[PDB]
């Protein structure tokens, strides 16, 4: 037929269409809903940078005073993705808002499809032409962090890391292949010079997408180092390999130069002159390898008298010297050697991040190959066989590209071991080496013959071997696509309760029009951010867990205290004010210390921070992880007697009982700010009032069609019914049920000792509080009382109501309470009763103006009897 020299493009097109179905069509209904949902968190910060860059085109900010309030943080996100989305938005006339997000959602998907090309190139320039076709197909179905970070809506720079790293290695090894065996006058032609120039541009674009992309230079230097010290071992045109590297690194340094001075110091992620020195310094190291080979060529190592081994040895001594004599700038070493800390994380606080946890390990510290299936499918094991075979073949053929690919493979495996995120780097590794595996078997099992016997050839073809070549193609491709089809059917991002709450914040908190204007200003790059930023108008901060910082800035257009850059977390052990030391504050006086230092005016708390994410906040605040279970106790159990019990230790739980897989928090938890805010609805606090709460968790919103959420008994039976139903399958109860179970445990363990109850009802997913000076209600009191209590009923915008209590002790025959709610406020969460203030046997009722709450007015209210 016509597929002659042309099937290889027929598979690439089919591979691209499979990639489109997984990346664009599968998560389509998850990205395009009630709004355009960019996935995760970081795609929302790129969206922030892009609509600012579009407004100030062609200029770009390198420091953001919005996030990390009130200090601002330097922007490490690369100019590649920022300028790509910015130009893409202008071409489609989408400069902000939902229309801009719809354009940005396709960029990660297109990068995932386009990755077929650099994977083909790298595989062809190392192995053969058939294997490059398998690798292109396999990279179209590999799941895990590669597929999820290249899906529709996940406009992050991780796909462009993988795209440009593989592009750099392919173009570099293509340049070495086009240059080897030729003299310099031939390699100096424009046709030959184009190959290392292209390789240098791909390296520059790699760094321009990721400040830590300079790591490609020591990897390429590792190619030359091992090719030199093994001159009799490996067979490589070392002189032309050195010259390709010189041109490649010089061009890359020129590409990086115009972006090199946007950080006031050396940095490995921020766009600083450190990366410029790594690229420029790599060019002179490659130029030093030029002399060592030019000296070995003439025979300089035998005239001095060291032997053929001398040339390897002088490389080793200079590898030690040329680094040792680079003490001319010790900050360079400190940042260069800093890479070894990247794959290690004894921080513990950092461990609580979902993307950083080490591969091959459970949250119990035991080896596992379970993520290898969930992230690569069969390609991992098919990839190891291709790696081991490549090592076997390298020891026989001694091809240099096969050696460099192995070095790349082993370096990416160490990074994969460190953090599970770097699976987006190892994805192209298993796809390339499984292609090497499947290509070996397809030739030895006569499938390459039967394919050409199918049209226009004659071969001795064993259908028994062909049937098995088809059967292991099954095993490599089918279970891999199964996981990719499932994982691509949903996309992450904020839920409606988070989005609705944040849009409400943007339109119902003061200065929304000033924040909107300041959101698009081209901020100057400061020399330091250790002092609070000098804002052009009176700003305020919004404190929450660091997960939601980008959502706060991009959706609410408000300045968050903490962000997904793990900035603004703070801790308690050092009294560093931040998110953790605020939400784990054990009394309101300490939380006011943290809030005042950070100029906090608003608090956003969700049910996640209340339940399953509270453990991380105690880990950050305390630093030590075993020092964090102090906030936790035992478990609930459904015993064979048909009753529900509670035990401190697992041994106290009776046999045949059914253990709700939910660790009930300790008494210390219920005294912290997160409990007082979300689980007690702000009761007991004098400087905070609830102003807005979102809808319920979806499960309980569904439950309310047949459950009376004003009936504590009906809620309790429903929560206990669900918890057992899901404990039967070893699954935790839903979040809305975890909150109800948390409230039930407080009433059965720590309530009777105090007298302040909590309604067993559920509540809204996201809750917003405003920081208040507070109306000071002070007055005289009778002769023999030591305590004064305040009572008021609050009703939220979801028609849910709760009690606000506060108790103070009498001193000098006088009480003083500070009240955060008012009775003429504009907020959708209002009190429906006056304040009932009790002083022993004397009761009085008071209503408070909003002006007295804002300005902290003192009100005299005596509760005294003669007696």
């Amino acid at each position: 037929s016509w597929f002659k020299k042309y099937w290889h493009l027929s598979v690439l097109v089919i591979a691209a269409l499979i990639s489109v179905k997984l990346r664009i069509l599968n998560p389509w209904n998850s990205v395009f809903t009630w709004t355009v949902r960019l996935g995760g968190n970081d795609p929302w910060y790129y969206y922030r940078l892009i609509e600012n860059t579009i407004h100030n085109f062609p200029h770009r900010i390198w420091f953001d005073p919005f996030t990390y309030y009130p200090y601002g943080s330097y922007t490490h996100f690369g100019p590649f993705l920022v300028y790509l989305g910015s130009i893409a938005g202008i071409i489609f006339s989408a400069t902000s808002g939902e229309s801009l997000r719809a354009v940005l959602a396709f960029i990660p998907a297109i990068g995932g499809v386009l990755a077929i090309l650099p994977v083909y190139l790298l595989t062809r320039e190392v192995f053969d032409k058939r294997a490059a076709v398998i690798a292109a197909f396999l990279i179209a179905i590999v799941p895990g962090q590669f597929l999820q970070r290249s899906i529709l809506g996940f406009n992050d720079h991780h796909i462009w890391e993988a795209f440009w790293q593989v592009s750099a290695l392919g173009t570099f090894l293509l340049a070495y292949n086009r240059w080897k065996g030729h003299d310099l006058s031939h390699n100096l032609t424009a046709r030959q010079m184009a190959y290392p120039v292209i390789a240098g541009i791909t390296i520059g674009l790699y760094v321009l997408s990721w400040g830590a992309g300079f790591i490609i230079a020591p990897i390429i230097l590792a190619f030359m180092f091992f090719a030199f010290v093994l001159a009799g071992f490996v067979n490589a045109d070392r002189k032309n390999l050195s010259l390709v590297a010189v041109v490649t690194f010089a061009v890359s340094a020129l590409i990086y130069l115009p972006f090199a001075f946007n950080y006031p110091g050396f940095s490995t992620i921020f766009y600083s002159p450190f990366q410029l020195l790594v690229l420029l310094g790599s060019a002179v190291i490659a130029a030093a390898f030029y002399q060592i080979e030019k000296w070995n060529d003439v025979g300089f190592f035998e005239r001095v008298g060291l032997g053929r081994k001398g040339m390897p040895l002088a490389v080793i001594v200079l590898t030690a010297l040329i680094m040792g004599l680079f003490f001319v700038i010790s900050p360079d070493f400190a940042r260069n050697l800093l890479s070894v800390v990247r794959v290690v994380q004894p921080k513990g606080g950092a461990l609580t991040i979902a993307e950083v946890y080490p591969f091959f390990f459970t949250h119990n510290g035991e080896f596992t190959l379970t993520n290898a299936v969930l992230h690569f499918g069969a390609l991992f094991f098919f990839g190891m066989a291709g790696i081991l075979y490549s090592a076997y073949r390298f020891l026989k053929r001694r091809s240099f590209p096969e050696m460099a690919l192995l070095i790349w493979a082993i370096a990416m495996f160490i990074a994969l071991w460190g953090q599970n995120r770097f699976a987006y780097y190892f994805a192209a590794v298993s796809a390339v080496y499984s292609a090497l595996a499947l290509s070996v078997v397809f030739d030895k099992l006569h499938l390459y013959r039967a394919l050409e016997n199918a049209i226009g050839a004659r071969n001795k073809l064993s259908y028994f071997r062909v049937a098995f070549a088809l059967l292991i193609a099954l095993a490599a491709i089918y279970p891999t696509y199964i996981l990719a089809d499932a994982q691509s059917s949903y996309a992450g991002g904020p839920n409606k309760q988070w989005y609705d709450a944040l849009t409400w914040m943007r339109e119902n908190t003061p200065d929304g029009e000033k924040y909107d204007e300041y959101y698009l200003q081209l901020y100057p790059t400061p020399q330091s951010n250790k002092e609070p930023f000098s804002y052009p108008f009176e700003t305020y901060g919004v404190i929450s867990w660091w997960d939601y910082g980008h959502w706060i800035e991009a959706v609410a257009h408000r300045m968050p205290i903490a962000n997904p850059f793990q900035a603004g977390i703070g801790n308690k052990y050092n009294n560093v004010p931040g998110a953790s030391s605020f939400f784990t504050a054990e009394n309101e006086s300490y939380a006011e210390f943290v809030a005042e230092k950070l100029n906090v005016k608003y608090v956003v708390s969700d049910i996640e921070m209340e339940t399953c994410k509270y453990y991380a906040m105690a880990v950050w605040a305390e630093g030590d992880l075993p020092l964090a279970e102090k906030y936790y106790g035992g478990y609930f159990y459904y015993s064979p007697t048909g009753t529900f019990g509670y035990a401190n230790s697992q041994w106290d739980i009776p046999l045949n009982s059914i253990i709700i897989p939910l660790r009930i928090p300790s008494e210390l938890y219920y005294s912290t700010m997160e409990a007082k805010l979300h689980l007690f609805d702000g009761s007991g606090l004098s400087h905070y009032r609830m102003i807005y709460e979102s809808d319920y968790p979806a499960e309980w919103k569904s439950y309310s069609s047949q459950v009376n959420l004003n009936n504590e008994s009906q809620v309790l039976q429903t929560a206990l019914y669900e918890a057992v139903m899901r404990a039967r399958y070893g699954v935790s109860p839903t979040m809305g049920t975890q909150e109800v179970l948390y409230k039930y445990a407080y009433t059965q363990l720590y309530e009777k000792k105090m007298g302040i109850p909590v309604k067993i009802a559920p509540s809204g997913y996201v809750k917003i509080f405003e920081r208040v000076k507070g109306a000071v209600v002070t007055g005289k009191v009778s002769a023999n009382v030591t305590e004064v209590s305040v009572n008021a009923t609050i009703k939220t915008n979801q028609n849910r109501t709760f009690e606000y209590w506060q108790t103070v002790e009498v001193k000098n025959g006088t009480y003083t309470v500070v009240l955060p709610y008012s009775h003429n406020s504009d907020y959708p969460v209002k009190p429906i009763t006056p304040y009932h203030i009790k002083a022993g046997n004397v009761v009085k009722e008071i209503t408070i103006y909003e002006s007295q709450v804002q300005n902290g007015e003192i009100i005299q209210l005596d509760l005294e009897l003669a007696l």
């Binding site: 996935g39 995760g40 968190n41 970081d42 962090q145 999820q148 970070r149 609580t352 991040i353 979902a354 993307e355 946890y357 949250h363 599970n420 995120r421 994982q487 949903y490 992450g492 867990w545 660091w546 997960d547 997904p564 996640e608 339940t611 399953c612 994410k613 453990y615 991380a616 979040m735």
Partner: peptide, 9 residues
Amino acid sequence: APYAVTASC
């Protein structure tokens, strides 16, 4: 889906 967020929820 593990991304730049707190885990186990």
